[PDB]
Symmetry: C3
Subunit: 554 residues, 3 copies
């Protein structure tokens, strides 16, 4: 409880003194660090970004001389051509159609797009024409001497459908100027600025290169900066956007909050004639003449200038930086993942069999086998079916994970596992059964259902028994050695009774298993051959009992 809490687990590591792997690791670490730092700096991922709230105030300067037909020469000032800024847009009239002295009465509709009538059949009665802006009476009447148009109750004289005058009457509007004052705020960052600061000169007009910070814009300059023709757009009008981009850095050490001005036509050039190309609106001036209520309809074409203000303000935020660093921390395991993959791949035996002979250049990479055997310790799941057998004729060990369904273990033929290398430091001291192949194996006395477990020979092929080897007597059948091992485990062991024979048998089994399998993990589930088993059992006979044989440790 108390002790379990006060524990620290650290990973066991193998440190490789390799030039190539160290170089690869450092190259990858530096690459990851460089990319992560570059991304952090470029995208300012350490900054919290706040959108701006903007207020725009515009002022148009300019007077237009207009001459029309008696001959009437007049001047238009801001009140005569400008619609005050509403929201973030201002309108400049560039052309107009005037219809003076309109009365609500009957009149022929203007002949637009060949809207001629030859009979009263074509003209419906009671039909509200949104183009003509009147109610048809069902009659066709002469609009002039030659052509006739459907009659309508409307504001008369009706002139809707008349084309915009060409050239535009207020062409001189290209020479008008607009002063744009832009106040922006980031309330989360509690910062505010404006596009005009002390030091600027009113004698400036905006230029992309010479005066990119002057907020005074000539309208024609706006149009010609983005390849638009003010003279043409003036006839039918349009919508132009003045984009103000605020890429603002609010850190004291990198403070930069300046506006960037740009221009973009917002109305489609090739809008279909049916979809009301350009920009215009109809303005009515109502008055009384004699006893008649009249109105002067001005179809004003012009350019609506939409001032579009957008941008973000970035300020250092520790939480954003921490989240980014945490997001990128796992990328620093790239070197370990790559080098471990290299070690795993170049540890395979196949590489030596096929790859290396074909490509002798990659021969020095065989050292990865040593790294893998120093890094990885394979272990198999211990289950009752797990058995290990060893044949003296063969050089390797065999692992059997399959149940013995009556077939002798000698024939059940599991997979092959290598015998571990023995600790040389520790070794610096001094009617036979059909499945048998050595003439010493005896039939098992276990129950038939599990008799195949012990049906194992010391060798696969005929030959001399392992029991005949000199080492077998000393390692296994030497009573002195087994007694010494017993004393080592139990110094005060009493060498009396029938248990001493059982203990010697167990230690002899363990000794053979350790000798022929080395690994304790394999020795624990090893299976002794019948010959060696029975030689051990007769060296230490059991008096009045039946041998139980191998049992599952778990």
């Amino acid at each position: 409880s108390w002790n379990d809490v006060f524990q620290y687990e650290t990973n066991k590591v193998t440190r490789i003194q390799s030039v190539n792997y160290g170089t690869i690791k450092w190259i990858l670490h530096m690459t990851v660090f460089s990319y992560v730092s570059f991304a952090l700096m470029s995208d300012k991922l350490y900054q919290r970004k706040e959108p701006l709230i903007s207020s725009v105030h515009t002022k148009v300067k300019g007077v237009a001389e207009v001459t029309e037909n008696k001959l009437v020469h007049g001047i238009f000032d801001t009140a005569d051509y400008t619609l005050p800024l509403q929201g973030n847009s201002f309108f400049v009239m560039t052309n107009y159609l005037k219809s003076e002295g309109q009365e609500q009465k009957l009149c022929p509709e203007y002949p637009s797009r060949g809207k001629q009538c030859h009979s009263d059949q074509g003209c419906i009665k009671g039909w509200m024409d949104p183009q003509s802006k009147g109610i048809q009476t069902g009659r066709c009447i002469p609009y002039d001497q030659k052509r006739k148009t459907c009659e309508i109750f409307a504001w008369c004289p009706a002139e809707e459908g008349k084309e915009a005058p060409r050239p535009a009457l207020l062409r001189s509007a290209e020479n008008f100027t607009v002063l744009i004052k832009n106040n922006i705020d980031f309330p989360g960052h509690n910062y505010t600025t404006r596009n005009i600061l002390p030091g600027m000169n009113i004698s400036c007009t905006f230029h992309k290169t010479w005066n990119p910070q002057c907020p005074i814009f000539r309208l024609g300059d706006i149009f010609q900066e983005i390849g638009e023709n003010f003279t043409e757009v003036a006839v039918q009008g349009g919508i132009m956007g003045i984009e103000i981009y605020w890429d603002c850095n609010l850190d004291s050490w990198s403070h930069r909050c300046q506006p960037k001005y740009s221009f973009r036509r917002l109305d489609d050039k090739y809008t279909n004639e049916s979809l009301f190309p350009g920009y215009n609106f109809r303005y009515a001036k109502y008055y009384k003449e004699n006893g008649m209520e009249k109105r002067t309809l001005i179809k004003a074409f012009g350019v609506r200038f939409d001032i579009l203000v957008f941008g973000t303000g970035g300020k250092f935020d520790i939480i954003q930086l921490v989240v980014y660093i945490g997001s990128t921390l796992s990328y620093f395991g790239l070197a370990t993942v790559c080098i471990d993959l290299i070690i795993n791949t170049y540890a395979s035996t196949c590489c030596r069999s096929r790859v290396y002979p074909s490509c002798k250049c990659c021969e020095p990479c065989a050292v990865n086998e040593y790294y893998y055997r120093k890094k990885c310790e394979p272990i198999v799941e211990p289950k009752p079916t797990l058995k290990y057998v060893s044949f003296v004729d063969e050089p390797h060990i065999w692992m059997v994970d399959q149940q013995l369904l009556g077939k002798s273990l000698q024939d059940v033929k599991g997979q092959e596992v290598p015998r571990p290398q023995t600790d040389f430091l520790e070794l610096s001291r001094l009617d036979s059964p059909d499945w048998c192949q050595c003439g010493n194996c005896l039939p098992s006395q276990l129950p038939e259902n599990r008799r195949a477990l012990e049906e194992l020979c010391c060798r696969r092929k005929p030959g001399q028994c392992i029991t005949t080897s000199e080492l077998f007597s000393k390692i296994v059948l030497s009573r002195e050695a087994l007694q010494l091992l017993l004393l080592y485990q139990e110094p005060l062991l009493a060498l009396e009774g029938e248990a001493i024979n059982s203990k010697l048998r167990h230690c002899a089994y363990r000794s053979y298993a350790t000798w022929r399998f080395v690994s304790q993990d394999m020795a624990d589930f090893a299976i002794l051959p019948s010959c060696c088993r029975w030689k051990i059992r007769k060296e230490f006979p059991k008096t009045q009992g039946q041998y139980s044989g191998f049992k599952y440790p778990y």
Copy 2:
């Protein structure tokens, strides 16, 4: 320096050939990968998202026939009922109250909500009534034959408080159409589009299902799509929002930037009468009649249509993808964490004592003890108080981490630790003290303050001494074996002088400690019993000195 930099550390790993653990690991890896990929695809976390900047241009089409009372029949066209788009909203008049020929003079205020006066006391003088829109004079005068209302200096005839006409005069506005042109831009992504593209037909009107991309909307259709009644709203007016959502994907392979249109009433239906329900504004037309400056006040009720354009444009960004992948990489350790937790929990001994007998189904999970002992190597902090003792009668070892404050170590009673399994591969070769329990322990010759350190018996309970065992003489008291060990450590060691006895004593102590504790970590802080210690010391007596005893290695 140079070599230390060229190093790679790799973790030591134990590979388990387990079907269940491999299956669990792969299931968890696939689950994590699937969720991470699904989140990335669904939220487009590989995309950087930019808000759009929008421009809206509206055009209302329609004519309304209005008949009022002589009987006056007229028609309203766009100039008579429409307020041009300003910002992103347009207004359509649906009802109106007209007050013609107003003069700044004295008049009785309109009797609204029973605003009657019976005496001059109720009518204050100089009071500016924002409802009546005039200055009270303090007098109560007859507004008509029967009822009287307070006098005010105001625009007269004053009609403020008159209810909106019912039914609405411009009901036919439900049949008006609005064409909405929406230009949107993502400047960061340098992309722009509009809601009208070549191919569309003007003969379309919007429908949620049939024509969801037609930008021509009948106002009544707008109202009835969201269960609003245009006829009723027309009387007092309201505010309707046309929402244009641009969920735009700007990747070439998944390009989809189309508008979705929706409608939402923006004015509260149940606004209190005191809070100005609906939508109206007062418009003044000033003129001169005779020598008098007059004005026609139109209280125009109608629907303000707010065009609300919102959305984001997503474009693939490598940094966003990298940050997301880094954020999600640590989730791939889930399999390892879960399997390690399983191994730790099922390695506990308790599971066998209580859990397994109750639930025999979870018995095969005992293999986790083997995995844990193959994965974890416990070690304790080496401190001067750390001691290990072993009693031949007992089967385990005892660890004492507490200072001996004069109490004999035999009685100080630390915790219990298991004795490690000996390497069987290496073992394949050939007036007694009160605290004593074997009759061979002698009083310690160390200073009293630290005499309790050596006050240890080979056993807890009375019995035969471990020294009497045969193995004790060979392992510990055999001069030949100790000399051989000395030669192994120091091949050219000179067996002369008084140092040879000290070296043999040290090696005998080490041999006993290794034999009775196995582990070198426990043997280093082991404590020899007094009996064995003094038997060793008399086998190799010290000539002219005092034994120093156990010392702290660190």
Copy 3:
């Protein structure tokens, strides 16, 4: 294939029972968890945040009494001083200059800022003055009896440049009220609310403390809340922002979506006179008098109130939470990184040599050497140049990684490595060459080009040969021991032919290498001295062949 997929790799770990390290680990884990949770809660990083779409509807209440000079006393109601909300801003007239009965004709320009003319030279002809708002004719004419100003074709009488009246005519506008209704929506979250809900009283007016949720604002209160003087601003006008911040939490358990009102002047106080200080616009009322088309120009100064609505709505999103948790997961490795760094640093030998004597307080930290030797297993890259040598006179081993370019290995002098501690548990059993220093080394029989490999002596300095040690005969030259090892490796080995001598030689080399280097990794690339090599080779002579010597295992 099938088996390789069903594998789980778990890291080998050493568990340290340390109070300090466990405490540090838990402190760091708790610190990381606390900061991560605090950041998640404070920034709502579990929430997805959506910007709001807003609609604003304003209503101004108030009447202003204005007296001017005959003496004219009038009242202004909303239609006389208010511009209806367009976009999200409303204008209140606070001052005005009136120019009645303007005709397009010739007139002298108003004498503003001393715009006097003394000769026709100063007055250009055809010059469009945007300040005077007329076309100069090139003549200088008397504007009055004393001063003269340039003639212009313009709307006359021209009064542009006249200063705003002081005090402001519509001062009483400070007492006007505005009701602001704000509808906001988060469409992604499908949530909508408004700033007015049932329960509020119309008899409220906004106050920062008493009535912070009342949407009725007195204009003078707006100005005086942020230290602005309405009386002064009324003369020339200005722009004020009413900021409505919606910090909205849309989770059911933490639902809070309320508006916060604030005020900010948006027009620069100290705008240069040339940059049009304040806020005004010119409004033209056109009419016909007699047979002349005239206009009344009102330069209306006032306050434009910009209603600025901003905010975000946060709603729990599982993906955002998952991404944040993944981003922060890697920070939980801080404890491991720090403790491992501590172990690595305090494991260095230098600490004992210099740091500990200077600062004895940090002496108990020497236990980190044990932790490091229990955590890390150094291994070097096995390459053909890798050799290990051991000198009996010296106590350590020497590693040589450099090619022998004809120089004897005895003199090539590589680095020093410690000899590993032998397993005491396993040890519990029973004309001389110029480079030589023992009198037993013989010249190598290998080819000259690689003769320096075997040119190694058992010791660096003159002395007795290691071969003379008793252990050398038993470990190396004992035929019985080598035969026993052969049987252990190959139980049925046939001790016949010339191969038995070669096998005994190989095992003798291995035995010496294991004895003098312990570690199998160092023993594999160890180099035997010439004396021991040739003693072994003469104990087991080769009959009719040439010894091949050491070979690279890989």
